[PDB]
Amino acid sequence: GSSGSSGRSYSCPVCEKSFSEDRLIKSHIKTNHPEVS
Numbered sequence: 001g002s003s004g005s006s007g008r009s010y011s012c013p014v015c016e017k018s019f020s021e022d023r024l025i026k027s028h029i030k031t032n033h034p035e036v037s
């Protein structure tokens with residue numbers, strides 16, 4: 001059968017801060033942790 005509905009939250013790989021969207025954690029990694037991306 002076909003897949004159901006989905007949605008997820010995220011946590012920083014460097015400082016463990018929570019985020020609600022993939023674009024927001026990527027913006028945080030780019031601004032606060034660029035040498036760790």
Ligand SMILES: [Zn+2]
Nearest residue numbers: 012014015016
């Ligand atoms: Zn972080």
